[PDB]
Amino acid sequence: GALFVHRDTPENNPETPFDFTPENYKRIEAIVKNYPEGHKAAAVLPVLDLAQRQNGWLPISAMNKVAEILQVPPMRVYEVATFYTMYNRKPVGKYHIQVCTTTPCMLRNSDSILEAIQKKLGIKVGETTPDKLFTLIEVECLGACVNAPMVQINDNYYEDLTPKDIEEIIDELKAGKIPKPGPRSGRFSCEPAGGLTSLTEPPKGPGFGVQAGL
Amino acid sequence: SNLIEVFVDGQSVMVEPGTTVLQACEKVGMQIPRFCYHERLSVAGNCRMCLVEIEKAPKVVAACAMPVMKGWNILTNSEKTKKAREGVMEFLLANHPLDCPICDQGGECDLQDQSMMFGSDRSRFLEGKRAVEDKNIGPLVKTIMTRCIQCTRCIRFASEIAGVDDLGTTGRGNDMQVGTYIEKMFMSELSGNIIDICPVGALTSKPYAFTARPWETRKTESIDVMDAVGSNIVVSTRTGEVMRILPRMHEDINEEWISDKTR
Amino acid sequence: PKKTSFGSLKDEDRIFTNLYGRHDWRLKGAQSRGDWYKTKEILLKGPDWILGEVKTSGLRGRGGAGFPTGLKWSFMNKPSDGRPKYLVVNADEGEPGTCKDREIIRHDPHKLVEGCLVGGRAMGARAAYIYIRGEFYNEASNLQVAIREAYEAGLIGKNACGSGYDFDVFVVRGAGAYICGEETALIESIEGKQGKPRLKPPFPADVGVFGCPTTVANVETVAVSPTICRRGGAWFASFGRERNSGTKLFNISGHVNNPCTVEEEMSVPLKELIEKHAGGVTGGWDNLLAVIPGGSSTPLIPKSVCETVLMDFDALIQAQTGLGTAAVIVMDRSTDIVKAIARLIEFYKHESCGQCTPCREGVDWMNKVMARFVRGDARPAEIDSLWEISKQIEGHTICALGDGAAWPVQGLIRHFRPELEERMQQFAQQHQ
Amino acid sequence: PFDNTTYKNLQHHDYSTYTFLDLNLDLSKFRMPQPSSGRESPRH
Ligand SMILES: Cc1cc2nc3c(=O)[nH]c(=O)nc-3n(C[C@H](O)[C@H](O)[C@H](O)COP(=O)(O)O)c2cc1C
Ligand code: SF4
Ligand code: SF4
Ligand code: SF4
Ligand code: FES
Ligand code: FES
Ligand SMILES: [K+]
């Protein structure tokens, strides 16, 4: 969790059952073939991420299994697991809400988004609802700054958010439906709101402007 | 004829290619300050205590890792070098604990001594300090990890010399921690050597704890008889009693290591 | 002849013609807009011709440092020893305020893939690894779909585009770390370690990913290269002031009416860029407080500087800042400028890899001081103290993240020192 | 047929947990054989 030392518990110890399913073992094979022979350790990050997609989070047994598959020392897998922030070393809720609070999103009122989520779910930053459906955390810039304020829920970005929009999104999740990702304001992606200021003409076709000699 | 000419404060020295700036200064008897660098470990370049000015180069280089180039003039005592050392020493001491009276390293501490020779004489750090949990790695090496300066010497020793990959860093940034992550004992026949290489009191001898200060010991250079290698050792005594055993460098025998039984 | 006013880029001269994703992003749509056109001829022209075109265009790195691309890529133009050679495409995109590379990956993936091939050919690389930040999952999947289409059309893989050159494009996802955008930290992450930057030398072109010769290039730098080859370096070099050539993707965020991504000519005035494309500053130009012109790592500039500054590498260096990634963050007069910068320091504190002393300890130190400056719980002598601390970090670290955390502090102290002292005065009076 | 008014990047609304790794598994057949360092790992 917040700590970077591991203490065994009944729910997280070397004997906690974990193993890759037969389908994930085929995915691991293709992952490992993307790298030169003699450098299997390159597959630690994607294989560790796969273990988290199958299981939701990474028990210490999952880290040991990854180290065994790739034949790297287990400590070199613990270092990766604790270095990178997308690995969950404690269980998380079904929907991991990640709100960006870095300056560009703060300037467009990411706090009101954060305050709205806490009210609707009745939790605080870093908590899981007693249903174990939602976990709320703050994150650094998610790479969608022009669509601020925005959140990521699992793999999906939800952008151009107001307090009403995020509440609608959470209700859809609570009702067992995944809402559509992308801006909720009116625009589709990153174009300026209120009409295109560029790229309004039909794009040119092949060979336009090609230099002589080709 | 492969040697190249470089200068240390204007004095010419001929060095073979691949020699680092730090090694070039050694040849003229100048010891660059260091924490992470150890000549028997892989270069790390992370402590930044070895930063030095190259004449006409606007940026200081890490003397321990930078290969020296023909014609370079290394200024080991310029204001630019001295200000780099003072800055780095200041960062090292910001979160370091006020432990010298209770810390066994006191009196033979490279942090203490290099702070005296190369650091400022006062603090301008007005915040609270980091505090770290202690890790249990067996009955030989005590850990007080709040004193760790993250030089990674122990990690590189365990991996490269001892062939054990149990030590690493977990976390990131200011909360980066040296340890084993899980509860694990670093039991190797060469484990005790990480006490010597650790520049600070983070790793200390548990059997030796609290029994003596370095200045009061007498050094008797002697030989190990625990096996047939014949490791060279220093026997520390005080007022007629043996206090500890330390390695004594012998390039052709034990280098600067000893086994745990010897130690 | 030598145009002196820049901007007003026409649509025909825009490279990323699907920037807003209103046309098909898959192979058929990309080929209709001119992607993958005469790629075989470009590859057969040889590495020297491609590198010559890139050198002539005056292209500079779009990743934040702005090194001349043509010279940089030419480090790989050397005979092969035993080792393979690799092109690594930096799609980490972590700099706060920067979201341009996201648009390229999901809307013009085939420009990136074709750029990998052309750029890889110029360097003699056998494969391209595209490192994309782990959060960009849907963007990565779009890119993976486009790569599959390229393999099935014979454009990449064995005998790419029928040129006889073998090339692979791999996608590797990060796992949440801003430092993995740093070129050597990116390589370490691909090799399965913590993303901790390497010291240099060696340089990646000598010892890179898997210990092999490598070039790390930004997504935007790679994606423009096929067009620079098709339309010539001269055409690209005709935009912007000399040594600041080409078109550029700009993100405008913060307190503007229409935050947006847009492609505009290099050396365009900053004020014109905000007004024409972003719909002006919220509350009008007179409501502007400061701008961060190139992402979080560039020093902020105050309104007075923003009136006349041009958006290119040299112009912003004159303003004691930098172009960076060209991510313009606008702050109006209602902004708490101290809190805004204090939040960036907190970002760098959370992103420091912790490897080297001045950043591991120094950035955390600056974060604590800035937190007290926000509340005013400090004394004016600590301002010059903070300045000196930032100078002890800058230039003493392994990688440029330490520099990037020191520069915002220096910009705040340089341009808003009275605001700091005013707040210290308020706190003392209120508490006394 | 020049419609510059709809968003044509809707495919990712249907992506799932294993979309990325399924594409990588699909791509596996198109790759060139990897180079070799000459040993199973740096610890061999
Ligand atoms: C902390 C840090 C983060 C960086 N992040 C990125 C990034 O996300 N994308 C990028 O292209 N370059 C990034 N860079 C710059 C790269 O190290 C490198 O200069 C760049 O990828 C070179 O490509 P270019 O010459 O085409 O710009 C970063 C640098 C630092 C120090
Ligand atoms: S390690 Fe050195 S400086 Fe730190 S408390 Fe011990 S003796 Fe003092
Ligand atoms: S415990 Fe000692 S040797 Fe290991 S990293 Fe810390 S200071 Fe260095
Ligand atoms: S400057 Fe910071 S991020 Fe860069 S290597 Fe040093 S500690 Fe790591
Ligand atoms: S600052 Fe929030 S997405 Fe960039
Ligand atoms: S001794 Fe050179 S950086 Fe530590
Ligand atoms: K020690």
Written overview of the protein:
The structure is cut from a larger assembly and holds chains A (214 residues), B (263 residues), C (432 residues) and D (44 residues). Helix content of chain A is 34%, strand content 10%. With 214 residues, chain A is of the alpha/beta class. In chain A, strands 2-1-3-4-5 form a 5-stranded mixed beta sheet, covered by helices on one side. In chain A, α2 packs across α3 (60-70), α3 (60-70) crosses α4 (74-83) and α6 (110-121) runs parallel beside α7. The longest helix of chain B is centred in the N-terminal third of the chain and has 16 residues, at 79-94. Chain B has helices at residues 21-27, 79-94, 110-118, 153-161, 193-197; strands at 4-8, 11-15, 51-54, 61-62, 73-75, 141-143, 168-170, 177-179, 203-205, 218-223, 232-238, 241-247. Chain B contains 5 helices and 12 strands. Chain B is 17% helix and 19% strand. With 263 residues, chain B is an alpha+beta fold. Chain B is globular, with a radius of gyration of 20 Å. Chain C is α/β, with parallel strands linked by helices and 432 residues long. Chain C has a domain at 27-238: 3-Layer(aba) Sandwich (Rossmann fold). In chain C, the strands form 3 sheets. Chain C has a 5-stranded mixed beta sheet with strand order 6-5-11-8-9. Chain C has a 4-stranded parallel beta sheet with strand order 3-2-1-4, sandwiched between helices. In chain C, 66% of the residues are buried. With 44 residues, chain D is mainly α. Chain D is elongated. Chains in contact: A-B, A-C, A-D, B-C, C-D. The interface between A and C is large, with 65 and 89 residues. Bound molecules: flavin mononucleotide, iron/sulfur cluster (SF4) (3 copies), FE2/S2 (inorganic) cluster (2 copies) and potassium ion (K). The site of one iron/sulfur cluster (SF4) has 13 residues of chain B, from α3. The PDB classes it as oxidoreductase. Keywords: Mitochondrial complex I, Respiratory complex I, NADH:ubiquinone oxidoreductase, Nanodisc, electron transport, oxidoreductase. The entry is titled "Bovine complex I in lipid nanodisc, Deactive-ligand (composite)". Chain A: NADH dehydrogenase [ubiquinone] flavoprotein 2, mitochondrial. Organism of A: Bos taurus.
Topology summary:
The structure is cut from a larger assembly and holds chains A (214 residues), B (263 residues), C (432 residues) and D (44 residues).
Chain A: H1 22-32, H2 44-55, H3 60-70, H4 74-83, E1 95-100, H5 103-107, H6 110-121, E2 134-139, E3 151-153, E4 156-159, H7 163-174, E5 182-183
Parallel strand pairs in A: 1-2, 4-5
Antiparallel strand pairs in A: 1-3, 3-4
Helix pairs in contact in A: 2-3, 3-4, 6-7
Chain B: E1 4-8, E2 11-15, H1 21-27, E3 51-54, E4 61-62, E5 73-75, H2 79-94, H3 110-118, E6 141-143, H4 153-161, E7 168-170, E8 177-179, H5 193-197, E9 203-205, E10 218-223, E11 232-238, E12 241-247
Parallel strand pairs in B: 1-5
Antiparallel strand pairs in B: 1-2, 3-4, 3-5, 6-9, 7-8, 10-11, 11-12
Chain C: H1 27-32, H2 39-44, H3 47-57, H4 69-73, E1 86-91, H5 100-107, H6 109-123, E2 127-132, H7 137-152, E3 168-173, H8 183-190, E4 214-218, H9 219-231, H10 233-237, E5 247-254, E6 260-265, E7 268-269, H11 270-277, E8 288-292, E9 301-302, H12 303-306, E10 310-311, H13 313-318, E11 327-332, H14 337-351, H15 357-375, H16 381-393, H17 401-431
Parallel strand pairs in C: 1-2, 1-4, 2-3, 5-11
Antiparallel strand pairs in C: 5-6, 7-10, 8-9, 8-11
The complex binds flavin mononucleotide (FMN), iron/sulfur cluster (3 copies), FE2/S2 (inorganic) cluster (FES) (2 copies) and potassium ion.
Flavin mononucleotide binds at residues 61-65, 67, 72, 90, 92-95, 178-179, 181-183, 216-218, 221, 399-401, 404 of chain C.
